[PDB]
Amino acid sequence: VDKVAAVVNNGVVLESDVDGLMQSVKLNAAQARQQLPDDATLRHQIMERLIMDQIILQMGQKMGVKISDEQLDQAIANIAKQNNMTLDQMRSRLAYDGLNYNTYRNQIRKEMIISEVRNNEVRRRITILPQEVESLAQQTELNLSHILIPLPENPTSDQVNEAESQARAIVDQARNGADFGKLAIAHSADQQALNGGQMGWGRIQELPGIFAQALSTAKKGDIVGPIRSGVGFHILKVNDLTEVHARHILLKPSPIMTDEQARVKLEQIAADIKSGKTTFAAAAKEFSQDPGSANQGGDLGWATPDIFDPAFRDALTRLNKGQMSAPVHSSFGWHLIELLDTRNRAYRMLMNRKFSEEAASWMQEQRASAYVKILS
Amino acid sequence: VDKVAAVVNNGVVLESDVDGLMQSVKLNAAQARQQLPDDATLRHQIMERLIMDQIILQMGQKMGVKISDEQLDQAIANIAKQNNMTLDQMRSRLAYDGLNYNTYRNQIRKEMIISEVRNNEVRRRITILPQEVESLAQQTELNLSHILIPLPENPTSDQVNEAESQARAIVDQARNGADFGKLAIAHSADQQALNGGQMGWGRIQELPGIFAQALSTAKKGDIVGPIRSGVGFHILKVNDLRTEVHARHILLKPSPIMTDEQARVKLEQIAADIKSGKTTFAAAAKEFSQDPGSANQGGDLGWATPDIFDPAFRDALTRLNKGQMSAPVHSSFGWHLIELLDTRNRAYRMLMNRKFSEEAASWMQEQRASAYVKILS
Amino acid sequence: VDKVAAVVNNGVVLESDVDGLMQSVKLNAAQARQQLPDDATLRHQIMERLIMDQIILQMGQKMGVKISDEQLDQAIANIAKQNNMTLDQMRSRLAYDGLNYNTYRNQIRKEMIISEVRNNEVRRRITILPQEVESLAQQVTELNLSHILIPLPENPTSDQVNEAESQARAIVDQARNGADFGKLAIAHSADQQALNGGQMGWGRIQELPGIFAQALSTAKKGDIVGPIRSGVGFHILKVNDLRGESKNISVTEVHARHILLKPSPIMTDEQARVKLEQIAADIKSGKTTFAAAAKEFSQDPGSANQGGDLGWATPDIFDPAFRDALTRLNKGQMSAPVHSSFGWHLIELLDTRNVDRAYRMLMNRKFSEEAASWMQEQRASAYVKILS
Amino acid sequence: VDKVAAVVNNGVVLESDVDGLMQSVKLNAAQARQQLPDDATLRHQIMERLIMDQIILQMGQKMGVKISDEQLDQAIANIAKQNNMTLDQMRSRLAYDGLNYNTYRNQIRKEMIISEVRNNEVRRRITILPQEVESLAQQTELNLSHILIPLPENPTSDQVNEAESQARAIVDQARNGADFGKLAIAHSADQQALNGGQMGWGRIQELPGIFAQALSTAKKGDIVGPIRSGVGFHILKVNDLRGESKNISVTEVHARHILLKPSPIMTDEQARVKLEQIAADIKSGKTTFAAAAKEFSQDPGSANQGGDLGWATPDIFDPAFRDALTRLNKGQMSAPVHSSFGWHLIELLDTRNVDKRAYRMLMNRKFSEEAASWMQEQRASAYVKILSN
């Protein structure tokens, strides 16, 4: 006898489903020392989340979205890795905790089709204005929580004021010390609402410009006034605030040349170079072994010390720019080392900013233009 | 340290500029589920576009082309409208996206002067044959992508064959199911190349005749063989293939003396005398109707659309037979007799645009050739 | 459902045809950055043009004028050449633009019978007044200009002449207050060039009627030449551009003589040379004259019988060696033996010098006036009905 | 640098002037579809023409011949009328063609003194043989071109043979289809030579008698054999041949009338009835009409002539009168007829038709021969020198 909490188009939101999410938030809230608003408000947000997951889920069904066990495993695997364990290592923990593995996979699957559908649809909707990318192209990390008071695409004065009033009021209590994460859980409409509205740390530059402005002067602990956007009013709380170029001429010992046979050549090669008799690049193209530098006058392009054998790296260490080393023995053999020199995003940036916005906007529409009933 | 990708006459093509276009195509490609050729091919195409944008842009400089802020704003405005927003509504989105408004306008400016110079020059070049217009004058929507294999005005057999060969090969892969939009990005030389070579929907009649022939039998999904034109070889892919009334009324408007009944009773008589032949409708109208602008015109209301008429009136016409007179009708304007009389239900620009595209190709074809360009490595 | 715009004698002027001409002017206008008067005034001009083309065309019918496909091709071919293309190369451009080749040929045809009829009729009516030609034969800076004609009948009335004179004056006024002359031309000119800005192009001041030549001598660039009165009405010219008169042709000729001594199996080069040196010193030392030694040793008939006279010629016609010595000589001076491709000779440079239209200009002027009144008359007497 | 083509007495013939004439014939020739002989033969004729015009022109100088601007204008005006234009209308055509008006007038002037001198001199030399005119008094239009192979007044057998030979040759080519006009321009010596030798339409009667003979049997297209005159040998081609426009059939009537114009004394009813009686008396022998005429006719010039109005064309009469006149049989009498002059009785006596030079023709023929030998002599006795280039 699993009651229905709400009907959502071609389906329902089960009383059980509501409980699970409720408990998830409850525990996670506790295991983090976070105040939760009264179970009344809480249920509401949970519902809103469930109803939405339902809508975008059915959507996935219609447009035939399937997730192969092969991909599923990879996902679970990632959750395992994201949590310091191997698939078995996590599968057991789950077993130990009492969970039926398939039941779990099935949950991760639902999460995956929703993630997919949301991404795919927002894609088929994001809009790129003429010359926008080329325009952006041509032209102190922060940690903050976020609260969104939703507003339709083309709202009414009435709607805008309700929203603004609501937002202002929240900004008030925010400043009078009220628990911001509590408020987020109670009024934020963004994805992160249930999670205290935490965005985490990020570059002030990866944030929409509509915020970049106010967060430049932003001091730790500050509440950034209700910023208006296409999705509604935003409220943020400022929670917290050598390579080397070298070239070497190499000699590798084998059958004919012994370690001394070779070292003696390198002594001569070194002697003729310094005397001007021949040049280093010439000598290298004439003697060096390592193809991939040998005919390149011995050049080894730029690189990092580490990729070099321990004997070699240590050689560079005692060399002066332009200086030539004495012969050096390494795992590869004997070689003359000459030290030359020693030197010590934005588009994805845009894409992600455009995506969050659009995704909000989308769900905004979906939730509105959807058949949903809430039973008692 | 912004390297130079190429030198173009009195100027250069910056490495940055190349990245911007690269990223533009990349995003737009993704946001549209469109395969892109390897970054090598892609850079080439982007280069060709940039080098050209450069040439025709310096050109604009010399012949002193300026775009007043007033026009600019109108342009941006149109882009906003073309995208469902108000100037502010777009200005903010840009802000939100992180763009410096001026840097943006300046981009829109460069696009504008280029658009202008190209148009103007092509104008100063298009050629109208004697009696062509008068000749054309006397004599199934379709969606298709386009790929152009360029060829000089007076090319050599060697050139023509290289071109034909290349075109043939593409048409092959096209029919073996290869992604046409991908090929367009990789080898098309038309303006639309970078955009999959999409032309969109259009009348088969608004296309050059050199194609009208093959696109008549064209079934959806077809690749139309390498058509030869003065600009080179063309390849098209058929992507997809898909009342008023005349009436007259004699009107009476109630006020002080004539009440709604005072009025309706008159119209009963006016109607009764018309049908009995005692007076004619047009006469009755000139003798009683109110609405000047039909009253002295024997009540004629000229031709019009039902909608411009009050709800009561329009509904009246609805139940009236042609030639039939209505009974008195009350409307927002008053009381009136309604008689329903009757009920009725490009090519030169066509030519101009066909001649323009061709000419614009030929133009740039020449400019790119007779221009000093260096491609740094 | 192609309505009739106007009735013309035994034919009509279709609305379709009026659109065609309207569009041709429209495009061409744009393709040239040319202001056009309002479609009302334009339609009028287009009509007049079509009405006339109609008249003169039925005329071709009656007097049976036919254009063979052979000559038509030649004409189309000329348009092609005039436009930098081959018959095929244009035939294709046409195909690309969407036109039916036959439909096009037919248009070129109509254009051709009209041109023929007009020329034939005009020439026929050209008259030569008594003593006119002799009287001319007695008598003693390229320019580009647009033209506007305000029409007037052969024998007009004071009223007509005044309306014309008044309308013309008003145009010269606006012309000088900077109005677009080409716009005015398309709006009022009655000449053939009207619909084309009234452009005549570049031309010698001489190739123009004398009633113009007068004012066009003081004419500064940009000027508007007052309404000149002719038998055809009032004329107005705008001095578009004004350039220099292309230099003539300075072909320089030389008068020379020579005594030719081509060597042979008998006389060697040293023999054919030394012989000269002597045959020369005798000329200088009065022992004998050059022309004497010419008709005496010169091995060039056509020359030797003329005393060695080569007549007047352009130096390039001679052998290079000959031409050369010829360059390093003073008038009357003699050269040493000069070896060329025909033998050896002594060259004396004697001297140096540098080196219908009036009647064609007259007849052209005549054809000009005639053509104008002819149409003036044809149009005037024709049965024309413009449908409102 | 206008060379002299030929010297003529006290003057010359400039190369320019030769070009002018060459060009005039050239244009006119084209504007008429007329073959011209080679420029060589043509130059000759042009020369001969210029030389003659020169001679007769200096002659005009000596005997002081001047043409007033007044008469010149009249002439030019006539060229304008002859050409469907007004003086102004032509003066402009000239301006448009590029000519200097004065230079033009001067050409017309030179043409006029030549015309005068020639006429004056010729008339002076016309002679009338004893009994010639009396002897004359006792005794189908045609269009033809003419060619004259000249001969002196008293030529020699040699001259006459050369002439006869040359003429015969031309009549031959003429008949073998050769262009007659071409021949004319190439050999004719008459004034019309340079103009294809065209004389135009004319009565066979207005021509010299030595032609009238052969031109009576002449069929269109014919070449009339070389006729010998005192001026040389003539040859005519019968260009076209049309009908002779009918004469003029005017009709006259002979009538009598007795005039009774009413007045303050006699009213119309009185002036009418009076007649009715004065008429019945004529019919009933009581009296004769001519009697009642010289008796009551109020029209002297008629009443004294018995009422005879003599022969007159009907239209000369009052309409009423002319009308009764129409409804009358010969010898018949009318009832009283009221007109604008009064009342009268009209008797139509008779009707007849009447239709509508000889010496003018004679004198013209004369002027014709004289003008020919006159030039023949002038040229012959003149100081002429034709230069090569």
Question: C96: which chain B residues are within 8 Å (Cβ-Cβ)?
Answer: 208-210, 229-230, 354, 358
Closest Cβ opposite residue C131 in set D95, D96, D108: D108
Q: Note whether B322 and B340 are within 8 A (CB).
A: yes
The 3-state DSSP class for residue C147 equals strand
Chain C: touching chains (3 or more CB pairs < 8 Å)? B, D
A136 touches chain B (CB under 8 A): yes
Residue A238 — φ and ψ, nearest 5°?
-80, 95
Question: D98: which chain C residues are within 8 Å (Cβ-Cβ)?
Answer: 136, 209-210, 213, 361-362, 365
Number of other residues whose CB lies within 10 A of the CB of residue D141: 15
Q: What is the 3-state secondary structure (H, E, C) of chain D?
A: CCCEEEEECCCEEEHHHHHHHHHHHHHHHHCCCCCCCCHHHHHHHHHHHHHHHHHHHHHHHHCCCCCCHHHHHHHHHHHHHHCCCCHHHHHHHHHHHCCCHHHHHHHHHHHHHHHHHHHHHHHHHCCCCCCHHHHHHHCCCEEEEEEEEECCCCCCHHHHHHHHHHHHHHHHHHHCCCCHHHHHHHHCCCCCHHHCCEEEEECHHHCCHHHHCHHHCCCCCCEEEEEEECCEEEEEEEEEECCCCCCCCEEEEEEEEEEECCCCCCCHHHHHHHHHHHHHHHHCCCCCHHHHHHHHCCCCCCHHHCCEEEEECHHHCCHHHHHHHHCCCCCCECCCEECCCCEEEEEEEEEEEECCCHHHHHHHHHHHHHHHHHHHHHHHHCCEEECCC
Regarding the domain delimited by A242-344, which CATH topology (the fold level of the hierarchy) does it fall under? Answer: Chitinase A; domain 3 (3.10.50)
Q: Residue C325: in which H helix or E strand, if any?
A: helix C320-327
Q: What angle do CA B309, B313, B319 make, to 5 degrees?
A: 125
Q: What is the DSSP string of C87-118?
A: HHHHHHHHHHHT--HHHHHHHHHHHHHHHHHH
C129, D98: Cβ pair inside 8 Å? no
**Rg of chain D on CA atoms, in Å:** 32
Separation of alpha carbons D293 and D271, rounded Å: 15
The amino acid present at C216, given as its one-letter code, is: L
β-sheet bridge partners, residue B334: B331
CATH for B243-345? 3.10.50.40
Separation of alpha carbons C220 and C241, rounded Å: 9
Q: Give the contacts of C311 (CB within 8 A, at least 6 positions apart).
A: C255
Q: Residue C347: in which H helix or E strand, if any?
A: strand C344-354
Chain B: touching chains (3 or more CB pairs < 8 Å)? A, C
From the list B80, B66, B70, the residue with the least C-alpha distance to B112 is B66
A133, B19: Cβ pair inside 8 Å? no
Question: C79: which chain B residues are within 8 Å (Cβ-Cβ)?
Answer: 129-130
Q: What is the 3-state secondary structure (H, E, C) of D13-58?
A: EEHHHHHHHHHHHHHHHHCCCCCCCCHHHHHHHHHHHHHHHHHHHH
Separation of alpha carbons A140 and A174, rounded Å: 23
Burial class of residue C64, CB neighbours in 10 A (0-12, 13-18, 19+): exposed
From the list C315, C327, C268, the residue with the least C-alpha distance to C276 is C268
| Look-up of token digits 């999705």 | A231
Write out the residue limits of the CATH 1.10.4030.10 domain(s) in chain A: 1-124
Distance from the D35 Cα atom to the nearest Cα atom in chain C, whole angstroms: 17
C138, D19: Cβ pair inside 8 Å? no
Q: Which class in CATH covers the domain with range C139-245+357-381?
A: alpha beta
Separation of alpha carbons C228 and C188, rounded Å: 16
From the list A18, A149, A110, A54, the residue with the least C-alpha distance to A372 is A54
Question: B17: which chain A residues are within 8 Å (Cβ-Cβ)?
Answer: 134, 138
Residue C205 — φ and ψ, nearest 5°?
-60, -25
Q: Give the contacts of B323 (CB within 8 A, at least 6 positions apart).
A: B339, B340, B341
Chains D+B touching (3+ CB pairs under 8 Å): no
CATH number for B1-124: choose from 3.30.390.10, 1.10.4030.10, 3.40.50.720, 3.40.50.1100. 1.10.4030.10
Q: Residue C150: in which H helix or E strand, if any?
A: strand C143-151
Closest Cβ opposite residue D79 in set C129, C155, C366: C129
B96, A209: Cβ pair inside 8 Å? yes
Write out the residue limits of the CATH 3.10.50.40 domain(s) in chain B: 139-242+346-370, 243-345
C104, B135: Cβ pair inside 8 Å? yes
Q: Note whether C242 and C143 are within 8 A (CB).
A: yes
Positive or negative CA dihedral for B200, B205, B211, B216?
positive
Q: What is the 3-state secondary structure (H, E, C) of chain A?
A: CCCEEEEECCCEEEHHHHHHHHHHHHHHHHCCCCCCCCHHHHHHHHHHHHHHHHHHHHHHHHCCCCCCHHHHHHHHHHHHHHCCCCHHHHHHHHHHHCCCHHHHHHHHHHHHHHHHHHHHHHHCCCCCCCCHHHHHHHCCCEEEEEEEEECCCCCCHHHHHHHHHHHHHHHHHHHCCCCHHHHHHHHCCCHHHHHCCEEEEECHHHCCHHHHCCCCCCCCCCEEEEEECCCEEEEEEEEECCCEEEEEEEECCECCECHHHHHHHHHHHHHHHHCCCCCHHHHHHHHCCCCCCCCCCCEEEEECHHHCCHHHHHHHHCCCCCCECCCEECCCCEEEEEEEECCCCHHHHHHHHHHHHHHHHHHHHHHHCCCEEECC
The amino acid present at D117, given as its one-letter code, is: V
B79, A130: Cβ pair inside 8 Å? yes
Closest Cβ opposite residue B104 in set A123, A135, A229: A135
Residue B209 — φ and ψ, nearest 5°?
-70, -25
C268 touches chain B (CB under 8 A): no
Question: B130: which chain C residues are within 8 Å (Cβ-Cβ)?
Answer: 79, 108, 111
Distance from the C100 Cα atom to the nearest Cα atom in chain B, whole angstroms: 8
Dmax over CA atoms of chain D, in Å, equals: 102
Q: Note whether B73 and B90 are within 8 A (CB).
A: no
Question: A349: which chain B residues are within 8 Å (Cβ-Cβ)?
Answer: 98
Separation of alpha carbons A365 and A373, rounded Å: 17
Separation of alpha carbons C75 and C107, rounded Å: 12
Q: Note whether B237 and B198 are within 8 A (CB).
A: no
The 3-state DSSP class for residue C313 equals strand
CATH for D139-244+357-381? 3.10.50.40
CA atoms within 13 A on the CB side of C141: 12
Q: Which two tokens stand for residue A163?
A: 């929203």
Pair type for strands D12-14 and B373-374: unpaired
C108 touches chain B (CB under 8 A): yes
Separation of alpha carbons A212 and A139, rounded Å: 15
C361, D94: Cβ pair inside 8 Å? no
**Rg of chain B on CA atoms, in Å:** 32
The correct answer on CATH 3.10.50.40 for the domain covering C249-355 is yes
Residue D191 — φ and ψ, nearest 5°?
-60, -35
- Chain-centroid distance, C-alpha A251: 47
How far is CA D45 from each of CA B309, D8, D166, D183, D355, rounded to the nearest angstrom? 94, 16, 16, 12, 46
Dmax over CA atoms of chain B, in Å, equals: 98
D97, C213: Cβ pair inside 8 Å? no
D99, C135: Cβ pair inside 8 Å? yes
User: What angle separates helix D39-62 from helix D101-125, to the nearest 10 degrees?
Assistant: 80
Q: Note whether C60 and C117 are within 8 A (CB).
A: yes
- Render the burial of C261-274: b for 16+ CB within 10 Å, e for the rest: bebeeebeeeebbe
B123 touches chain C (CB under 8 A): yes
Separation of alpha carbons D25 and D21, rounded Å: 6
From chain D residues 7-26, the ones with a CB under 8 A of any chain C CB are: 16-17, 19-21, 23-24
Write out the residue limits of the CATH 3.10.50.40 domain(s) in chain C: 139-245+357-381, 249-355
CATH number for A139-241+345-369: choose from 3.30.390.50, 3.30.70.360, 3.10.50.40, 1.20.58.390. 3.10.50.40
CATH for B139-242+346-370? 3.10.50.40
Separation of alpha carbons D8 and D51, rounded Å: 7
Residue length of chain A:
376
Separation of alpha carbons B208 and B230, rounded Å: 12
B259 touches chain A (CB under 8 A): no
Q: Give the contacts of A99 (CB within 8 A, at least 6 positions apart).
A: none
Write out the residue limits of the CATH 3.10.50.40 domain(s) in chain A: 139-241+345-369, 242-344
* Determination technique used: X-ray
A210, B92: Cβ pair inside 8 Å? yes
Chains D+A touching (3+ CB pairs under 8 Å): no
Separation of alpha carbons C348 and A33, rounded Å: 126
Separation of alpha carbons C312 and B192, rounded Å: 69
Distance from the D355 Cα atom to the nearest Cα atom in chain C, whole angstroms: 39
Separation of alpha carbons C95 and C118, rounded Å: 31
Distance from the B185 Cα atom to the nearest Cα atom in chain A, whole angstroms: 18
Write out the residue limits of the CATH 3.10.50.40 domain(s) in chain D: 139-244+357-381, 248-354
Q: Which class in CATH covers the domain with range D248-354?
A: alpha beta
**Rg of chain A on CA atoms, in Å:** 32
Distance from the B103 Cα atom to the nearest Cα atom in chain A, whole angstroms: 6
Question: C33: which chain B residues are within 8 Å (Cβ-Cβ)?
Answer: 123
The amino acid present at C53, given as its one-letter code, is: D
Closest Cβ opposite residue D100 in set C127, C139, C366: C139
Distance from the C81 Cα atom to the nearest Cα atom in chain D, whole angstroms: 32
Q: Note whether B154 and C118 are within 8 A (CB).
A: no
